Design a protein around this ligand. Structure first.
Ligand SMILES: CC(C)S[C@@H]1O[C@H](CO)[C@H](O)[C@H](O)[C@H]1O
Ligand SMILES: [Mg+2]
Ligand SMILES: [Mg+2]
Ligand code: NA
Ligand code: NA
Ligand code: NA
Ligand code: NA
Ligand code: NA
Lengths: 1015, 210
């Protein structure tokens, strides 16, 4: 029957014998255990060691496997993805389906995971009530047997599948057999941009319920206008025999304090001409001055639902955390508890570098703490319902959740081919309805999503209306078909830019400022995805946040995304490395496009995470004279765990500092007047730095946590004092091949054929391994690269434009190299042209002035042909002979920062180990730049000017030529790149050019000056 | 103190190169002990009789952003025509230059002055790579105005009919000029991107006879 019916190739069969979906149950037989959310004796975990055998197709599975263990099976941990145990390859593909598009059919070679468990069941569980098995997540489809007997079948990888085992089990030892198919008709609705894996990858459990049972309960909270009053409404449904002596009590608790309680027998109000529900009841509890739930203050109550008899015998209890909050859209604004939200959100996939798509509590907590510590208040479940514990953690720690149905059909042509087809409505409906039935009681869930990237079809309209009808408490959003269709309460585009329209046919991505005011448009706009954080990215992140604060109806968005989906592989030495698409023999694949995170897979931050934190700050600052104005962006809480640290420094040297308590009402202002600062001794720029510090530990942060910062330039004293004239005078030694400058134990060598400074000496020691030369290129960032167009790679991409113009191949032609003796200095004058197939791209004109003090002043004037693509950088590079431990600089830091991603960086004196001046992006590229630098120190060298720099043991060439960070090798000495100018990194998306015009090097003529000297 | 600031000489040197004479200068502008601007220049005069002027200006960050970064002088010559390769032919400023076209323009001198009834800075032309007046030629990438009226006289006269042609011709050549604004005329209206806020400025000119 099972092999004959092929239920996995039939979108009309999504399950067999599966129980109805419902909120989380534990079936406590003790009310106090329910109240305190302690373990239930009636909810057992079947996680642990199971038996597993891999097969190439379901037809290859032996019949004997139903009856007894297969000798060739291995003992494996469950939950797991079987790809992570090495049984077959995980596949990384973005849009293109990993199988031939031929719905509803799947390949005949369909990897099949045969799981089994021999487990014990207490005799008491079988003498009474109902024993069910719960599979929280099985990817992608499965048949279930118990003691050789077929039980049922299930689809949808991301929601629990439950089956009644009461008639199948015996007291003592039982054996489950679970046949899991990698591919099914379900796969057509599961085309999310992520690793394609399979197996029993979420918890398996056994739940015992009484025969007379709570089968469902819904909790709603309604408020008066000022939220000083609430009604909690609980609808409770039973299964089993109705008796007049049956009662339901719903009690509500605030900690140890019972707030309210209500009891009724079963029997609902008249619904229609046929009566009402005899098997339901609704309890209404009044709540005065309820403590309201929000991400700022996650106030929770506990609701306990008791099924019992009249004389007071408990049958069972269920329970949930209740958050008193109202979500509504009014006058075009999304309001929480009457106040307009500003979503500081991120998309988060369930990904673990070792365990694949298996989630654990520790990892979930780590993610939430990191999110809250970085000023996120919201998370989108991209693009499926999450492990059930996620919502509990968001309830308790305080994050706004967008719950998203497991429907993505990205690879269909056109994208709505299945979602417009009524034959696929049943399969689609289940993914939406069963999500709502599971998750509707979580306060953290504030928005329902219909899925992702599935065009817009009539099935979306039906399911949109279904949700509005069953749950009026939450807006529904959906991005497909243009982000503003009839299937969304929220304009929710992905990668719509701030000011720039992208007028694609049928589905344009308007500028977000423009989108809001389109004729007839009234809805709030919240980007479901923006700021694609792939590698060295988040360029222009500040531009989104400026718009979010300025425009009331721009209520934020969800960054793409939280965590790099890299996986761990092991080489010959057994050393782990970070792997992306293709690294498992998986093909076709989309390579490094699985890595778009603000953090690495092990949750180490990328530099971009700090830019997010700074831009998402909850305190705004202004400076007027000696007055600092602090504005709170909190909607509900006062600043009762905040103080302001201020600090005034002269070019890094502390001059004055102090602390002021912050007492700001939500949305309020505080004026802080700085004391009269002492007069500064010397020339230089005074800088004011403020930080908001949390003195007290919270559930999500440690004592001393810094939540906000800002800097301003105060007074500047320009240096007018002449340097004391050095007695020493440099000598010029002219050769046919070299201009050489000597000053005591110091030599500068200028090659007269190349026109570059080829060597510098301090006595015996060589200073350089490669000459000092102009550099106009960078090892391309992911944003420079983009995507393959078809017959070729997209010619619009920055790297493609640079390659075609010959930037990476340009060869310096010497036009002029001359030497001159001055009164107290030697002047070297050079000119170079970079040319490619007869075309002059760049002209660099330089003067090097070496004086008696031992300082070399380099003046660089560059012409860039207006018709060549704008260069990645205007600067110099060389390989220094020395390797030193520390890097010390006065400029923007401490972290990596770029011209369009430097708002988070502060001006000060920074000192880091050299290894921290390299950012270990899994896909190597230009990295580790620091901007606004006035002074750089490395070993015996000092550079002064106004430049950007990076410094590392890797050449741009090596970074450019290496696909993976683990393959990088430290070169001899230290590569230094000092730029007068550096192009922005972009990142509004990572598949088209995204560097804003004001960050492109388009001025045509560039000037910069450096002083190189010994320290 | 921008209008009252006096130049103080910090350095003035002369050097002889293999084929040129180099003059190096440095000035500071101060008001009440506060240094507003510093100007460092080299003048390089070679065997072709061309004077290459290189100018690097430092503007104190806490001083109000200046209206222009440039050079001025009163020329002895009064010529009938002004000829330039740059944006024209009409008066144009950094935030009002979209209508102007880059080309070779040639006007009578009077056309290089806009007779605003209330006298002010006027007649600027931006994006200019070559200016020609009498025997003089200037080359680079600059903004200029040229008239018989000093900035001082424009500043001191309330009506245009009270202006008097001065001896010779006042030339203002700017590396950088601030926008004129105009969103309104009763509050600051020059957009941030048209204010002179970079702190460090560089421009280069070549003065010669052609
Ligand atoms: C490459 C685009 C045409 S599709 C683009 O790919 C991204 C890669 O991380 C994400 O998956 C986005 O959701 C998707 O829109
Ligand atoms: Mg099916
Ligand atoms: Mg997709
Ligand atoms: Na807003
Ligand atoms: Na991706
Ligand atoms: Na406080
Ligand atoms: Na690379
Ligand atoms: Na006047």
């Amino acid at each position: 029957v099972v092999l004959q019916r092929r239920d996995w190739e039939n979108p009309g069969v999504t399950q067999l014998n599966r129980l109805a979906a419902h909120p989380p149950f534990a079936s406590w037989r003790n009310s106090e255990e329910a109240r305190t959310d302690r373990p239930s004796q009636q909810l057992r975990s079947l996680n642990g060691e199971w038996r597993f055998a891999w097969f190439p197709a379901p037809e290859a599975v032996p019949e004997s496997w139903l009856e007894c263990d297969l000798p060739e099976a291995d003992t494996v941990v469950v939950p797991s993805n079987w790809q992570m145990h090495g049984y077959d390859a995980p596949i990384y593909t973005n849009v293109t389906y990993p199988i031939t598009v031929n719905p509803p059919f799947v390949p005949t070679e369909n990897p099949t995971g045969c799981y089994s468990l021999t487990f014990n069941v207490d005799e008491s569980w079988l003498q009474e009530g109902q024993t069910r098995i719960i599979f929280d997540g099985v990817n992608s489809a499965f048949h279930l047997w118990c003691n050789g007997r077929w039980v049922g079948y299930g689809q949808d990888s991301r929601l629990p599948s439950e089956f009644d085992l009461s008639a199948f089990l015996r007291a003592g030892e039982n054996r489950l057999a679970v046949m899991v198919l990698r591919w099914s008709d379900g796969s057509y609705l599961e085309d999310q941009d992520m690793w394609r894996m399979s197996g029993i990858f979420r918890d398996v459990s056994l739940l015992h319920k009484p025969t007379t049972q709570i089968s469902d309960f819904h909790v709603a909270t309604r408020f008066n206008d000022d939220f000083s009053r609430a009604v909690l409404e609980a609808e409770v449904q039973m299964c089993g025999e109705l008796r007049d002596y049956l009662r339901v009590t719903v009690s509500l608790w605030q900690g140890e304090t019972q707030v309210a309680s209500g009891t009724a027998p079963f029997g609902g109000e008249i619904i229609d001409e046929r009566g009402g529900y005899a098997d339901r009841v609704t309890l209404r509890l009044n709540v005065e001055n309820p403590k309201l739930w929000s991400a700022e203050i996650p106030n929770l109550y506990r609701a306990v639902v008791e099924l019992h008899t009249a004389d007071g015998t408990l049958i069972e209890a269920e329970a949930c955390d209740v958050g008193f909050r109202e979500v509504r859209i009014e006058n075009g604004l999304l309001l929480l508890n009457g106040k307009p939200l500003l979503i500081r959100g991120v998309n988060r996939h369930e990904h673990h570098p070792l365990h694949g798509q298996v989630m654990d509590e520790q990892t979930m907590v780590q993610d939430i703490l990191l999110m809250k510590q970085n000023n996120f208040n919201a998370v989108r479940c991209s693009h499926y319902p999450n492990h059930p514990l996620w919502y509990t953690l968001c309830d308790r720690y305080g994050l706004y959740v967008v719950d998203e149905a497991n429907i993505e059909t990205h690879g269909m042509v056109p994208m709505n081919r299945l979602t417009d087809d009524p034959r696929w409505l049943p399969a689609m409906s289940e993914r939406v309805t069963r999500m709502v039935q599971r998750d509707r009681n979580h306060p953290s869930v504030i928005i329902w999503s219909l899925g992702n990237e599935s065009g817009h079809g009539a099935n979306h309209d039906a399911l949109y209306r279904w949700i509005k009808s069953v749950d009026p408490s939450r807006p529904v959003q959906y991005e497909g078909g243009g982000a503003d269709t009839t299937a969304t309460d929220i304009i929710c585009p992905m990668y719509a830019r701030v000011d720039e329209d992208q007028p694609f046919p049928a589905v344009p991505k308007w500028s977000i400022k423009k989108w809001l005011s389109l004729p007839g448009e009234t809805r709030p706009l919240i980007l479901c995805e923006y700021a694609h954080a792939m590698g060295n990215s988040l360029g222009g992140f500040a531009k989104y946040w400026q718009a979010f604060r300025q425009y009331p109806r721009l209520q934020g968005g969800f960054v793409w995304d939280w965590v790099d989906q890299s996986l761990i592989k092991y080489d010959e030495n057994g050393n782990p490395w970070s792997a992306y698409g293709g690294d498992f023999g998986d093909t076709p694949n989309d390579r490094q496009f699985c890595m778009n995170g603000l953090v690495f897979a092990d949750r180490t931050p990328h530099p971009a995470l700090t830019e997010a934190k700074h831009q998402q700050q909850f305190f705004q600052f202004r400076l007027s004279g000696q007055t600092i104005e602090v504005t709170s962006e909190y909607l509900f809480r006062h600043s009762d765990n905040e103080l302001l640290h201020w600090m005034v420094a002269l070019d890094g040297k502390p001059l004055a500092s102090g602390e002021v308590p912050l007492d700001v009402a939500p949305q309020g202002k505080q004026l802080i007047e700085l004391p009269e600062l002492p007069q500064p001794e010397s020339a230089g720029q005074l800088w004011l730095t403020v930080r908001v510090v949390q003195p007290n530990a919270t559930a999500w942060s440690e004592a001393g946590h810094i939540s906000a910062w800002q800097q301003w330039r105060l007074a500047e004293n320009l240096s007018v004092t002449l340097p004391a004239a050095s007695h020493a005078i440099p000598h010029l030694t002219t050769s046919e091949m070299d201009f050489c400058i000597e000053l005591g134990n110091k030599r500068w060598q200028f090659n007269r054929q190349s026109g570059f400074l080829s060597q510098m000496w301090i006595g015996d020691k060589k200073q350089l391994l490669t000459p000092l030369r102009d550099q106009f290129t960078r090892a391309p960032l992911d944003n420079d690269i983009g995507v393959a167009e078809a017959t070729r790679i997209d010619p619009n991409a920055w790297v493609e434009r640079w390659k075609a113009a010959g930037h990476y191949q340009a060869e310096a032609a010497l036009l002029q190299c001359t030497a001159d003796t001055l009164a107290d200095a030697v002047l070297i004058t050079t000119a170079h042209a970079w040319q490619h197939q007869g075309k002059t791209l760049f002209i660099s004109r330089k003067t090097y002035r070496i004086d008696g003090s031992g300082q070399m002043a380099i003046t660089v004037d560059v012409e860039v042909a207006s018709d060549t693509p704008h260069p990645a950088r205007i600067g110099l590079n060389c390989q220094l002979a020395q390797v030193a431990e520390r890097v010390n600089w006065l400029g923007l830091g401490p972290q990596e920062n770029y011209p369009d991603r430097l708002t988070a960086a502060c001006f000060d004196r920074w000192d880091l180990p050299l290894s921290d001046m390299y950012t270990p992006y899994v896909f190597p590229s230009e990295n580790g730049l620091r901007c606004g630098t006035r002074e750089l120190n490395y070993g015996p060298h000092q550079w002064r000017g106004d430049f950007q720099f990076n410094i590392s043991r890797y050449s741009q060439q090596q970074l450019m030529e290496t696909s993976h960070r683990h393959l990088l090798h430290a070169e001899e000495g230290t590569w230094l790149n000092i730029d007068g100018f550096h192009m922005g990194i972009g990142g509004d998306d990572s598949w088209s050019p995204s560097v804003s015009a004001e960050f492109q090097l388009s001025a045509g003529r560039y000037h910069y000056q450096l002083v190189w000297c010994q320290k």
